[PDB]
Amino acid sequence: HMTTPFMSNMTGWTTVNGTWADTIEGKQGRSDGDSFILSSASGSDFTYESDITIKDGNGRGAGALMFRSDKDAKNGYLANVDAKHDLVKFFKFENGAASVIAEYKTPIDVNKKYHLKTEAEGDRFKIYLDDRLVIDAHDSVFSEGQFGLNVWDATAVFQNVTKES
Ligand SMILES: OC[C@H]1O[C@@](CO)(OC[C@H]2O[C@](O)(CO)[C@@H](O)[C@@H]2O)[C@@H](O)[C@@H]1O
Ligand code: NA
Ligand code: NA
């Protein structure tokens, strides 16, 4: 029977762009720019988390959780680990244009598993890196939408991708 090594409680994964696959390590994405995959799962308030490992390829950029997204990932929130810029970023896309909401600055590495967790509750967003709170910010732009994953100028692997509402 069909099985995948990607572990998640979410289904319906639809590739927006980039190169996305399920490998023995998890769901891998790669692109030089931003690229996105969206689950059919949707929500408003939730805990959304994943293991994220940035690999050697492309520009050793970033891997991200995306949430409260529209169908083509043009509008939504992201929380990432960015090895190139050494930060955890909470940001939004509005009609395909990015703007930063909050950051935590820390050295971020390639070939190191990170655990990233977002708790989205109304207009408040708490982001944890390896179980430590690093961002606790407010933003009112988006209230609901799809869950997904992103990479920016990176190859990255996502494993144990889960949401709880
Ligand atoms: O952290 C990666 C994440 O950063 C974004 C949004 O800040 O921008 C990437 C990169 O693009 C520019 O805006 C210009 O090319 C730079 O200022 C920034 O380093 C997202 O696009 C990406 O997912
Ligand atoms: Na599954
Ligand atoms: Na780095």
Swiss-Prot record:
Cell compartment(s), UniProt: Secreted
GO cellular component: cytoplasm; extracellular region
Gene Ontology biological process terms in this record: sucrose catabolic process
Intrachain S-S bonds: none
Superkingdom of the organism of origin: Bacteria
Keywords, alphabetical: Carbohydrate metabolism, Glycosidase, Hydrolase, Secreted, Signal
Similarity section: Belongs to the glycosyl hydrolase 32 family.
Other facts: Levanase cannot be detected in the wild-type B.subtilis but is mostly secreted into the culture medium by SacL mutants, especially at the end of the exponential growth phase.
Protein's name in the database: Levanase
Underlying gene: sacC
Parent sequence residues shown: 515 to 677 of 677
